[PDB]
Amino acid sequence: KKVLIANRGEIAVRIIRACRDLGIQTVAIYSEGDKDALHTQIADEAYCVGPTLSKDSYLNIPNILSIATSTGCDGVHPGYGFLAENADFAELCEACQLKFIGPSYQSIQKMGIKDVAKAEMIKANVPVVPGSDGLMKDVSEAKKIAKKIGYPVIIKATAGGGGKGIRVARDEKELETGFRMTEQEAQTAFGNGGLYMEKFIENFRHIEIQIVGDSYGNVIHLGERDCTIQRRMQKLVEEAPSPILDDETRREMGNAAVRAAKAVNYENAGTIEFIYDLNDNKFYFMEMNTRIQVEHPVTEMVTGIDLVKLQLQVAMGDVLPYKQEDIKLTGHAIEFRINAENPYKNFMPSPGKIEQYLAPGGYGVRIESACYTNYTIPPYYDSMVAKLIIHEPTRDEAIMAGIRALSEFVVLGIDTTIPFHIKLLNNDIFRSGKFNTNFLEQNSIMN
Amino acid sequence: KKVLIANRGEIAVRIIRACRDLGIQTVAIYSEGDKDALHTQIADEAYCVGPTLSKDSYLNIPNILSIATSTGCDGVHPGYGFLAENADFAELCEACQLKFIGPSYQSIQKMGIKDVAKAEMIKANVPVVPGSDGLMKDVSEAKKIAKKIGYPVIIKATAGGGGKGIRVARDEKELETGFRMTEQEAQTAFGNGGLYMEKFIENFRHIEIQIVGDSYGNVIHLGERDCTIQRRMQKLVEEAPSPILDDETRREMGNAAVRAAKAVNYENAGTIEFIYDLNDNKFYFMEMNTRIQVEHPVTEMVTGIDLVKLQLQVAMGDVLPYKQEDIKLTGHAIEFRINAENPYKNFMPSPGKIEQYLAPGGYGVRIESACYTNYTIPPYYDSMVAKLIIHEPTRDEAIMAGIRALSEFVVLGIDTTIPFHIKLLNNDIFRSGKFNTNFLEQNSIMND
Numbered sequence: 037k038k039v040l041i042a043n044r045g046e047i048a049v050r051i052i053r054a055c056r057d058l059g060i061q062t063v064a065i066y067s068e069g070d071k072d073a074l075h076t077q078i079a080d081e082a083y084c085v086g087p088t089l090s091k092d093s094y095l096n097i098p099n100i101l102s103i104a105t106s107t108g109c110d111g112v113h114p115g116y117g118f119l120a121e122n123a124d125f126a127e128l129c130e131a132c133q134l135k136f137i138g139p140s141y142q143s144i145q146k147m148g149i150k151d152v153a154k155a156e157m158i159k160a161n162v163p164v165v166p167g168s169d170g171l172m173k174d175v176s177e178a179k180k181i182a183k184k185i186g187y188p189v190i191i192k193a194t195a196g197g198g199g200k201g202i203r204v205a206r207d208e209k210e211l212e213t214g215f216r217m218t219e220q221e222a223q224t225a226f227g228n229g230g231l232y233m234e235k236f237i238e239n240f241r242h243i244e245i246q247i248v249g250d251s252y253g254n255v256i257h258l259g260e261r262d263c264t265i266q267r268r269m270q271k272l273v274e275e276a277p278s279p280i281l282d283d284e285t286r287r288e289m290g291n292a293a294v295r296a297a298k299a300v301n302y303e304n305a306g307t308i309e310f311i312y313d314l315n316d317n318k319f320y321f322m323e324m325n326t327r328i329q330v331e332h333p334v335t336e337m338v339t340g341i342d343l344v345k346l347q348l349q350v351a352m353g354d355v356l357p358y359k360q361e362d363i364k365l366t367g368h369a370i371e372f373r374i375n376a377e378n379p380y381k382n383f384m385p386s387p388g389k390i391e392q393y394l395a396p397g398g399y400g401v402r403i404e405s406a407c408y409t410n411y412t413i414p415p416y417y418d419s420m421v422a423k424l425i426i427h428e429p430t431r432d433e434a435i436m437a438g439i440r441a442l443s444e445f446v447v448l449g450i451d452t453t454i455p456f457h458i459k460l461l462n463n464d465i466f467r468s469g470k471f472n473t474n475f476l477e478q479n480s481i482m483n
Numbered sequence: 484k485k486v487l488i489a490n491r492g493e494i495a496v497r498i499i500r501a502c503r504d505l506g507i508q509t510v511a512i513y514s515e516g517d518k519d520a521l522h523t524q525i526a527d528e529a530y531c532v533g534p535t536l537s538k539d540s541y542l543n544i545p546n547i548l549s550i551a552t553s554t555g556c557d558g559v560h561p562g563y564g565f566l567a568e569n570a571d572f573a574e575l576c577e578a579c580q581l582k583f584i585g586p587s588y589q590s591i592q593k594m595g596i597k598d599v600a601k602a603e604m605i606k607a608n609v610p611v612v613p614g615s616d617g618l619m620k621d622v623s624e625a626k627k628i629a630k631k632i633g634y635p636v637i638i639k640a641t642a643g644g645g646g647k648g649i650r651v652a653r654d655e656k657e658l659e660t661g662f663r664m665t666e667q668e669a670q671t672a673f674g675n676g677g678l679y680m681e682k683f684i685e686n687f688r689h690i691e692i693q694i695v696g697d698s699y700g701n702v703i704h705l706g707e708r709d710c711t712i713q714r715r716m717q718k719l720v721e722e723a724p725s726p727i728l729d730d731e732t733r734r735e736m737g738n739a740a741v742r743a744a745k746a747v748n749y750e751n752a753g754t755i756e757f758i759y760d761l762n763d764n765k766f767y768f769m770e771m772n773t774r775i776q777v778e779h780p781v782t783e784m785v786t787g788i789d790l791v792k793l794q795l796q797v798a799m800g801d802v803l804p805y806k807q808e809d810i811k812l813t814g815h816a817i818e819f820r821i822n823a824e825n826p827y828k829n830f831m832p833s834p835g836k837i838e839q840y841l842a843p844g845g846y847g848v849r850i851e852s853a854c855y856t857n858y859t860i861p862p863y864y865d866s867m868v869a870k871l872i873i874h875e876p877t878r879d880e881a882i883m884a885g886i887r888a889l890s891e892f893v894v895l896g897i898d899t900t901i902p903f904h905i906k907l908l909n910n911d912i913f914r915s916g917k918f919n920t921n922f923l924e925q926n927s928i929m930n931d
């Protein structure tokens with residue numbers, strides 16, 4: 037009946053749209069900085085939750101819970117980021133008679149301590165990257181494990197998110213220096229300096245499987261997303277299906293992801309991330325995001341399934357409206373994350389007022405955005421202007437259509453990364469579809 | 484390689500987008516009044532064709548042909564309206580070695596003299612609305628036929644388009660009066676005063692079938708569009724598939740449409756309009772539109788087929804890349820034509836500068852517009868702001884999702900018809916899916 041959206045930006049707008057499609061009432065929250073945010077305008081009601089820094093606004097749990105109960109909400113949608121993978125917030129909602137629109141706290145706990153997640157996958161017969169058994173207490177056993185696994189190794193925060201608390205070590209001296217750095221950063225960022233170690237995979241594709249469970253033990257997958265085009269770990273361009281994957285591997289990986297989700301009795305939407313090793317064409321579980329993702333639209337276009345609406349439906353108590361045999365991926369979709377950065381200045385942030393915003397339309401085109409003419413993106417959270425998604429019958433058609441779409445997208449007053457994406461789509465290595473995660477790093481797409 | 488777009492507005496934008504998908508270079512034209520027009524920005528080059536009134540700009544054939552050859556274009560896409568159903572311009576293009584993106588002039592002649600179109604359909608074994616065979620010489624001849632057909636009748640210009648030269652006669656005296664007014668109006672408008680007569684069908688549903696043929700004898704249909712929500716003759720809300728139609732009638736009408744198409748060796752995209760009579764559940768051919776239509780995108784979403792790209796593909800000599808067995812309509816789409824009119828003032832036109840324009844997005848939404856912030860829609864042409872299309876798995880879902888999308892569509896500075904479409908979507912009759920073409924005439928949505 038009524039849902040509080042515990043987020044901001046384009047995901048808040050997105051969830052709000054999903055609620056209205058189901059006739060659900062919407063409560064937006066905003067920080068002092070987000071006073072002009074679009075989601076606060078399109079919500080049925082909006083409430084200030086605290087000052088600009090996320091720690092006192094969007095992560096201010098007592099205030100979010102307070103507002104939620106005060107206004108008579110039945111649930112809370114966390115979106116992505118902020119409190120979406122926070123098991124304690126999830127538990128507190130439940131204790132308030134508020135439905136956390138997402139998986140259980142037990143589920144968030146199990147998959148949210150990434151070393152424990154791995155051990156759970158080994159027991160659900162899911163392959164995982166060779167590595168340490170749980171956390172390393174010392175550099176000493178980090179050095180011991182790393183010589184057992186073989187360099188290069190990657191040291192990762194077990195409580196980790198947003199790319200923070202991850203370091204490659206290519207020799208013992210790097211592992212020694214990187215251990216203390218990552219432990220420090222993790223304790224600060226997460227209140228948990230526990231680190232685990234993995235073989236650092238060098239030639240792979242980032243393949244992730246969308247899963248969705250209901251409250252009745254039914255789990256399905258909506259195929260894969262290919263998120264190999266990455267700058268500094270962070271995803272820039274996502275596509276569905278993967279250009280390099282055959283139907284037998286899609287099926288084998290989808291089945292692995294469904295085993296993953298039910299080993300932890302997973303409910304609502306999540307994503308299994310897999311490392312697809314191009315050296316032997318084997319996949320490895322890397323982690324689960326126990327939440328909706330930025331890139332969900334690429335999947336929604338090829339599958340025809342409204343994933344956020346399905347999140348709300350699953351939370352309201354609906355059984356899954358599709359079994360696995362009803363799911364098909366039709367056509368090809370590619371998402372471009374358009375940020376307020378200048379690709380001609382090595383992606384230097386570009387703050388300012390948007391003087392002209394003209395979003396493209398036409399066949400195949402979906403624009404996801406909270407930006408509008410005269411809007412100023414506050415520099416304290418994010419750089420996302422829009423996600424553009426192109427859906428065509430083939431990949432080459434999506435590429436041609438994407439240039440078309442991207443080429444008429446007017447965002448003036450600030451620099452954006454549209455030019456980067458236009459240049460990528462004209463790149464012959466990209467068009468070949470054959471490449472790994474290092475692609476941006478061992479090329480110079482901007483010329 | 485290079486194509487001139489012989490149109491304006493949102494359809495020029497649509498065409499230019501389809502050209503860029505194919506790697507084709509684009510030449511926009513514009514009237515003096517259309518200097519700010521979005522299609523002139525996104526085109527590769529833009530040229531002035533002349534003064535604001537269409538007669539000297541967008542219907543200026545000598546100037547359009549000069550720019551097409553001057554700039555070295557291979558074809559001309561006429562969109563809809565203006566020169567799209569002008570056989571003589573199609574001929575002229577062909578004589579200039581320009582591919583008219585559409586059917587042959589011969590086909591444009593056959594189906595564009597509407598009484599002859601009808602006669603061709605009877606030979607093609609396609610049902611037509613009862614009436615006269617050919618034109619009526621005289622008011623006397625109209626009187627005799629109208630007595631034979633039985634009142635009520637509708638007198639229709641044979642060279643008629645844009646809904647001019649059509650009026651109902653419920654009795655003799657009306658017919659005497661209607662004949663002369665319609666003959667005068669059709670002469671003025673079309674240079675052809677010839678009228679034909681049909682039974683005026685009073686309880687019906689507007690069901691039209693999308694056709695596409697290629698240059699190799701292949702003709703497919705992409706199912707139906709239901710355009711029953713009309714206001715004074717003009718379409719307002721379209722949906723695919725028709726909510727009141729089973730798949731046996733879908734096949735029947737599709738096969739009827741396909742016979743019609745190849746009866747005239749039809750190439751490229753056309754639409755066959757049927758009258759679906761709710762008294763006996765019978766369909767009758769009313770006319771063919773030998774062109775793409777305003778409402779094509781609702782078909783494109785349900786079928787996944789890019790129709791305007793397919794027009795270009797067909798015009799470059801491509802074999803139809805779809806077979807009939809492989810065409811499925813999936814889910815349900817509703818298009819809403821959003822105009823610069825005030826629905827709270829009986830749709831009074833609302834001229835002005837648009838001061839804020841915010842297109843909704845999200846799941847299932849597709850916006851078709853040439854409008855933007857600080858744009859002023861000239862009051863000289865077809866007054867569209869945007870088409871909004873919603874595509875969902877079911878009709879009820881589409882309705883809900885369209886309220887969502889329409890409710891956040893911001894257009895400030897002019898009044899628009901957005902509030903009418905929101906009131907339509909909350910109407911119980913519309914939601915039932917059961918109504919006929921006089922729905923907005925028997926109902927008053929704006930009071931709801």
Ligand SMILES: Nc1ncnc2c1ncn2[C@@H]1O[C@H](COP(=O)(O)OP(=O)(O)NP(=O)(O)O)[C@@H](O)[C@H]1O
Pocket residue numbers: 165190192196197198199200202234235236237238242266269309322323325473
């Ligand atoms: N074993 C590995 N070998 C090579 N690269 C890795 C490995 N583990 C992680 N990475 C890279 O580091 C990125 C982030 O890893 P991940 O384990 O997803 O961290 P995260 O902080 O949870 N990020 P998020 O996806 O936002 O939750 C991955 O997308 C890979 O590009």
Ligand SMILES: Nc1ncnc2c1ncn2[C@@H]1O[C@H](COP(=O)(O)OP(=O)(O)NP(=O)(O)O)[C@@H](O)[C@H]1O
Pocket residue numbers: 612637643644645646647649681682683684685689713716756769770772920
């Ligand atoms: N026999 C009929 N009985 C009842 N209504 C009719 C009949 N013929 C036409 N109409 C109505 O008049 C409208 C216009 O007729 P039509 O033959 O489509 O003319 P047009 O000028 O070619 N319009 P267009 O579709 O823009 O090319 C139809 O959509 C019907 O609503």
Ligand SMILES: [Cl-]
Pocket residue numbers: 116328329330331
């Ligand atoms: Cl994400």
Ligand SMILES: [Cl-]
Pocket residue numbers: 563564775776777778
């Ligand atoms: Cl039309």
Ligand SMILES: [Mg+2]
Pocket residue numbers: 196197198323324325
């Ligand atoms: Mg993570």
Ligand SMILES: [Mg+2]
Pocket residue numbers: 309323325
């Ligand atoms: Mg990850």
Ligand SMILES: [Mg+2]
Pocket residue numbers: 643644645770771772
């Ligand atoms: Mg007509």
Ligand SMILES: [Mg+2]
Pocket residue numbers: 756770
């Ligand atoms: Mg018509």
